[PDB]
Symmetry: D2
Subunit: 484 residues, 4 copies
């Protein structure tokens, strides 16, 4: 019964085609979503381009930031509706949407609004032959129209992570959320409209990737930049697509993240930590650990403790009492994950726990659930230990030596994140620095400070966002050089 | 003269060689060994391995000291570097001697010093448990940097990339333009004699497509590709590195405007536009090929510029009084002439030049053309829109401030712009509205290595210079410690 | 109406009290309780203890949220704050409404936001053993900040100190000017109602010598003394805290010049100098009391300024079209008129003003003077060298740029300068040569809370504003870890 | 041997001289000419004038190259500087050769490089008229910097101030400790031979009160006084410059603690505390004179330290394997020995040392004392609270983490602290709660010139190092352009 419209030039509009939004909990229809055609994408980009020359473009940084705080207020005012939207689309446990996702999304807008108010640029004085000198100063200007394309994992969070700094920097936006999670972004458009954001400043287009809204956005010469979060192969495709236009790009892509547990770790803390890093969001966060290395001396105790804890996870309804894990995002994704589950056994894995789907004997059997899964026994070369699965799974392997484990962690075409567990001062700092990734946590997992640079190396992405890196990426950096 | 590749600390020949030609007289200067795919792979592998050797264990202080030794090595062979740039390119000796070589030395010393003085950030955060966490950032070497450079001011542009790559602790596989391989070869020698470890700096010669340049861009062993050249080449490379999701930096083409307002110092502006139009015979990406002059001073401006253009001395690089050398090559000369023709066919008035000079000596075998000025073309003419990269500019009157801003911005390029006015508000008000990476007011071509440099639209993506180089040529990583 | 001290979460009276008088008409506004040394001790002890309470346990986010609540509390009682400033000082209602109260609110919000967005530094270093070390800096609360503020723009200058002090997690003992105690007392109420913990913010009323002010500077329990006021007071306080080696920040007096070059927009400059000379009745430290005008435009300038000055409306703070209220007090007026006499004895020509207006109503019992303009004095005249702090300026011709730079700088003060010129080079060349902390070009009084602010010579020491406030109000500590 | 003042380009004698004595043997090294108030004035006036000279017109690049020349000049006379430091101070040759002189050289190179690489800020703002405004900051020379330095690590602490002062374009009047005049005089020769313009660097010899030191602080011609020495001297100087409101930087006394937790590497902590207690024979402000050791390892720590301390070779600066030279002077030894007796009277157990060694040669005429270890004193003992500045530490057990932090902080000093622990959380959690400017974890005395350095409480005011030096030794001015 829910209908999700595009939002283009201050108007909610339908489209010729619509597609189904399906609750992964039970397989039921949540909404019809109007798919934007290439003409509507053009309408969005053109509206965005024009909006830069309107009231939005005349706003002082201070007024622009106040307006963005008004966006945040509007989300706050409709808090539980945003909670319901994320949960409906994704099966995410209510407790997590309510305590993490929606507050972080609000925090995205408030933080980048504040960064925009407090930020400044540089002055460089130079001597010249005639001895009267010159000044060089830098300015940040809006880059122009920012195309945003985002994934279904933590959808409102990752979507606003891009939309907030884009708007804070004075840009206008055309944004295409994942076909699998279009609700909260649609709600966000409403908040934009109600908050009085000028027509064309924020445009929402629904659709898929290839031969749809996503691809049409990437091929449009009217955009100044494409920021993207998704699969590595999608990243590469988009990088080719914007190449003729030499568009500014930012890619946050896949990973195969390791957690390392050294002999001097707090073992109970590491078990809890790896449990969370492996299975949070049912293993569907780019920051999850799918490879785990544990020192040989504590390997058996670690594996036994994690098995016990994993089998205590409650897989069930998003608002079921004590639920820890919802379903995967889709039947399609479940079929891929189970295909890896089979592959693991075929590759010689011992299945410590899970390896299948739960049996509910109710509507959830029509959903997309899988069991949290632990493997041992695979060599570092097994596909299941090298390819990103994006499910609730980890393979655990022993190690003996510090340099050895660092090399095995780094032996990967991905390099997003790593978590290290140790109580030793030197070890924490020495080892972290040698890990080839964009983010290392020591003795925790999933702490995010919006001020810090974030991104990956190798196939995990290019560039960094967060803090000044967002303020620089979403801005045109220009040098004005004045001869005195 | 023979120009060898430099790979894993060894000067090596190849299966094929191509000719380096002196553009002053069309003579052979050197044969140049073209690296093949096998040799490019050897260079990339050596670079990868070098990261694990003595280079990778140097303190930032020692690394910078070694980089200062590289610069010292260039200073000590200063005139050999001058001779090499001049021979390859036809660049006036005084310019190579006073600008190019010193700037090249400056690149190394400046980025070495930036590396020593740089630092990163600390963020403290509170947590639920109430014991907090520390987040700090570190700069690490990115890995292997692939450098591909052009023929315009070759040593300068080459070392502009190589210096910060090495300063940030990277290793380098570098492919200089086929037209200008000499100074880069000399640099390899300097690096060798300075005692730079094998594999740290690798020099590979050749072309782009189906040659060393392409092979480098396709190699999965590199961590980044930094490039300066034509926009179409940039696009091609961006596609090539896309599957590996390599870090990229693109400094591409332009069609820069100069704007002279009614309140400009007219004599200063005439001199300014002269230099910006014809320096290096118009073969610098920062050159002005479009000029907008306020209608009230238009005729006087064009008159004065013509006179100054015609006083320009076009000859030998070591000739007394020389202002302009030849174009880089006969092929480039053909292209530029083809444009000289197109302009006329497009309805242009040839205010001066429009052809080639006649010397009646070896220089007629060279690739000289004349400093040229056009008027009377539409904003929509090809000669006013496409990059020519010769000693030419078109001059058009303008009337209003908002008008000229729009006309300057009406371009798929956005590299640089120069503005001439004596008015305080106008200088800042206008500069800020030009859609380019760099605006000069009342001067041309001041460059400070600390400032961010780059273009918008087809003129490129990203910035280098100062902290932008320190951040581009480094892995930026975030380490979060729960306490 | 009675104004109490606010100590350890309680409003308290004292054994002695003093009058708060409306300068518009000499009428009693309130009785103000003077803190004795015992109460100042209580305040400092309470502030030390609050550092160990819930205040000291807040995350930066929660502390900043509380500061925004303080700001919200002022916004909610906006008109009461307006009334308080106007009552105490005679300040025009229009200015209190559009500048002072909003700026005070902005002080809290800006510094709260700076606190949330601020970070510190990480330095990596190599060691012999080759394992290396990390040095990181942290900002921690400095401790108890003593704040002593003046009567010029009282809530603005008070909150300019109190806000970053609280933003950095300090606790505060603050002593506002005895001439303007109301808005600070209102602020205490806002803090109380906002639920700011007891002892975090303490308000003590009184005078300087042998009163609350001196008692604060002499107390060994404070960690810093930040001060805005007369230069001689600054010196006195610098001596007083010397045995404790307390951190200090001084914003002191000035004798600011405005310079009008021949290429200035003449109407703009007349308007600019009119405002810089007579705003707040000449009672801002940023006012111009010396004006230098190029000889070519001197007579026209002076005539234009005379006419505009004579159109200024001097009168009631809420009178329609009012430009100037009274001076702060009869004592200040006695000083200012003494300078009015002195100027004539030194040989001044009185272009306009030079006395007191005649109202034939209650304002005759207030402390009004006329806006006044002098010419004909030498640069050595006392009236041209000593700070008067009234609505007055002397105007003098100059011929040469280097000359006027030297004459502007020839002073024991160095707070601010304003320059009027439409020339691009001149603005930048000249401004850079003026020995002050702040130069404006083609405007006056623009303040951005992100920028450093302060003076040189007798005008102060140190800077506050943006990062300088974040660093002054914090302990900057270095933690160096051997890896 | 004669040590002259250096004023306005000339070495000059004075009316009276004083004796420079070798503390190794009590023998006369040099006659030092004491500058009178008249000569101090000559110095300041010359420094003021050199600001308007060639020095004032150098580009930052040229200034920096000249400072590198100074560093080169020190390098060229390397062993002469070693000899000078050793003769004045009894410092072991090996240490002067490996630490002191190379650090002094590094002070000049690092700050010259910081000068070249530094930049400032641009803030854009909106205005009611809607046209906006630019605010930019500039760093300019502050003016004449007065430098007053101590005898502990003389050349190091002297150049630590002179280098940044010069790198920021100031001129300098510098007064080294009467106990250590030689290396500073040699430095003057280096500046002269490097062709530093006259007046830029001036050297005045003499004492403090009633001598060159006091006269410098009282001269109104200086712009700042930067000081390293005793806390009481600091307070005296802060009072002296107060009427002038001179910029000040104070690096003062300390009573630093080392804390050894039970999870420390015990052998590393023993070697670390041995060095922190006895390096330079206990005569560095960064030395540990209080040590707290967890009770579980107390007896073993104390036994291990006693054994290492009794292995230290006390003797001639070039004696083989020498670890400790003499104290700086007989007067200082008398003070240290008075404390040695006081400790006994206060009830201390003398674990080792407690007197002077017997050499049976000329060293008995010197100023040697033994490395000394006490236990058994209460935290309220004078010997545990007052700075001794000798080769001594008291060692006390502790039980709790919050307890030891409180005992470390229970001091009117707050310069530095060293903590020894292998635990990640503890290192970071404990370090941030120590109320000092500098905490080392698992090392002692690592200094990086980029980091802010200073103390809290009686240990100082302000910070120098890195950007804090570039900002302290510069005028920070804000230029605001209305567009
Ligand atoms: N933005 C700047 O700062 C800047 C500076 C100087 C020159 N330029 C531009 O450079 C152009 C002129 O130089 P150019 O003629 O040498 O440019 P170019 O693109 O033709 O060649 C540049 C380099 O790339 C190589 N190359 C060519 N094809 C390649 C491929 N398919 N794969 C990999 N490498 C390949 C060449 O061998 C050469 O080394 C002009 O457009 C000029 O504006 C820009
Ligand atoms: N905080 C630091 O970084 C640091 C570094 C080294 C030493 N110190 C401290 O230095 C002290 C020891 O050195 P010191 O004995 O040479 O210090 P000191 O205070 O006795 O003398 C230092 C300098 O000040 C001069 N002086 C003395 N009285 C003066 C006066 N009334 N006016 C002007 N100048 C005067 C002296 O001539 C000398 O040049 C110790 O307390 C030590 O802790 C601190
Ligand atoms: Na869905
Ligand atoms: Na050529
Ligand atoms: Na009053
Ligand atoms: Na001596």
């Amino acid at each position: 019964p829910s209908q999700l419209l595009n939002y283009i030039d201050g108007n909610f509009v339908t489209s010729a085609s619509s597609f189904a939004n399906i609750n992964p909990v039970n397989g039921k229809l949540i909404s019809d979503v109007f798919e934007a055609d290439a003409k509507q994408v053009n309408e969005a980009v053109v509206a965005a381009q024009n909006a830069l020359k309107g009231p939005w473009g005349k706003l002082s940084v201070q007024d622009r930031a106040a307006l963005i705080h008004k966006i945040a207020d509007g989300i706050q005012a409709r808090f539980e509706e945003f909670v319901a939207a994320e949960v409906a689309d994704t099966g995410r446990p209510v407790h997590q949407a309510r305590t993490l996702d929606i507050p972080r999304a609000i925090a995205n807008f408030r933080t980048f609004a504040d960064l925009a108010k407090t930020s400044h640029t540089d002055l460089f004085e130079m001597s010249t032959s005639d001895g009267s000198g010159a000044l060089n100063y830098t300015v940040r200007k809006p880059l122009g129209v920012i195309g945003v394309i985002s994934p279904w994992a933590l959808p409102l969070l990752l979507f606003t992570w891009k939309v907030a700094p884009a708007l804070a920097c004075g840009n206008t936006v055309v944004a295409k959320p994942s076909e699998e999670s279009p609700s909260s972004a649609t709600l966000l458009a409403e908040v934009m409209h109600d908050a009085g954001v000028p027509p064309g400043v924020f445009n929402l287009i629904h659709g898929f990737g290839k031969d749809s809204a996503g691809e049409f956005l990437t091929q449009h010469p009217g955009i100044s930049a494409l920021t993207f979060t998704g699969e590595s192969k999608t990243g590469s495709t988009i990088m080719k697509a914007v190449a003729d236009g030499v568009k500014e790009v930012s890619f946050e892509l896949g990973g195969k993240n390791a957690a390392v547990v050294f002999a001097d770790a707090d073992l109970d803390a590491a078990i809890e930590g790896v449990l969370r890093s492996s299975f949070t969001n049912s293993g569907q966060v780019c920051l999850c650990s799918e490879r785990v290395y544990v020192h040989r001396s504590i390997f058996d105790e670690f594996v036994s403790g994690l098995k016990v804890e994993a089998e205590r996870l409650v897989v069930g309804y998003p608002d079921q009492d004590g639920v820890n894990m919802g379903p995967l995002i889709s039947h399609g994704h479940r079929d891929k994950v189970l295909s890896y589950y089979r592959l693991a056994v075929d590759e010689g894995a011992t299945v410590v726990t899970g390896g299948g789907v739960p049996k509910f004997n109710d509507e959830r059997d029509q959903g997309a659930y899988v069991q949290p899964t632990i493997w041992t026994g695979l060599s570092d070369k097994a596909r299941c230990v090298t390819e990103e699965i994006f499910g609730p799974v980890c393979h655990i392997s022993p190690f003996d030596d510090e340099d050895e484990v660092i090399n095995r962690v780094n032996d990967s075409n991905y390099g997003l994140a790593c978590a290290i567990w140790t109580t030793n001062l030197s070890r924490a700092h020495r080892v972290s620095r040698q890990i080839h990734v964009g983010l290392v946590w020591v003795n925790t997992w999933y702490l995010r400070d919006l001020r810090t640079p974030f991104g990956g190396v190798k196939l995990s992405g290019l560039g960094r966002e967060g803090g000044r890196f967002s303020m620089d990426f979403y801005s045109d950096i220009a040098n004005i050089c004045i001869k005195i």
